[PDB]
Paper text:
Trx is a small cytoplasmic enzyme that can reduce di­sulfide bonds in various cellular proteins. Trx has a common CxxC motif (C: cysteine; x: small hydro­phobic residue) in the active site, and this motif is critical to its reductase activity. The most distinct difference between the two Trxs is Trx2’s possession of an additional 30–40 residues at the N-terminus, which forms a zinc-binding motif using four conserved cysteine residues. A. baumannii contains both Trx1 (hereafter abTrx1) and Trx2 (hereafter abTrx2).
Finally, the 1.20 Å high-resolution crystal structure of abTrx2 was solved with the MR phasing method. Interestingly, although abTrx2 was purified and crystallized in an oxidized state, the CxxC redox center of abTrx2 is in a reduced form, characterized by the absence of a di­sulfide-bond between the two cysteine residues at the CxxC motif. The structure of abTrx2 is most closely related to that of rcTrx2, which has a reduced form of the CxxC motif. Pairwise structural alignments of abTrx2 with the three structural homologues show that only abTrx2 has an α1 helix at the zinc-finger domain [Figs. 3(c)–3(e)]. Although the number of reported Trx2 structures is limited, this structural difference may indicate that the Trx2 zinc-finger domain may be rotatable. According to the DTNB reduction assay, abTrxR showed strong TrxR activity in the presence of purified abTrx1 or abTrx2. However, the abTrx2 C28V variant completely lost its TrxR activity, while TrxR in the R13E variant decreased by almost half [Fig. 4(e)].
Residue numbers in the entry: -3 to 139
Write the structure that this text describes.
Amino acid sequence: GSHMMIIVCASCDAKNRVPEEKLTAQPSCGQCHQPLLPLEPIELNEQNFSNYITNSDLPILIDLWAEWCGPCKMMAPHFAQVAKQNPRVIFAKINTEESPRLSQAFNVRSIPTLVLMNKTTEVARMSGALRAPELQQWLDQQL
Ligand SMILES: [Zn+2]
Ligand SMILES: [Zn+2]
């Protein structure tokens, strides 16, 4: 076998079977041709979340945020920078106002809250803004 890894497309929901050795090449979805591994934060919402989290093989670090949240805006560039540094981790964002049932299901209090998921299980979480080096260190400690 080709060490197939299930990479979900957040845009059309397709469960792409991607050879492990091809992940570094950042391929596009076989159905809709959107990027599968942009090394940028992807948008999850109530209409793509369950399919994405349930079927993904790679860990997913989720930033629960809102547009009016100052600490979220402080964190956003650091979250995007760390996303570029971890090609085998999906970085995702959930807007708590757009997706209130997801925010409630994650038991969010203050934002930003980051939740690390792996194969449907919550591995770890943290809250509050962090700079990129500290965020990378936290991620490495959990994985
Ligand atoms: Zn392998
Ligand atoms: Zn697609």
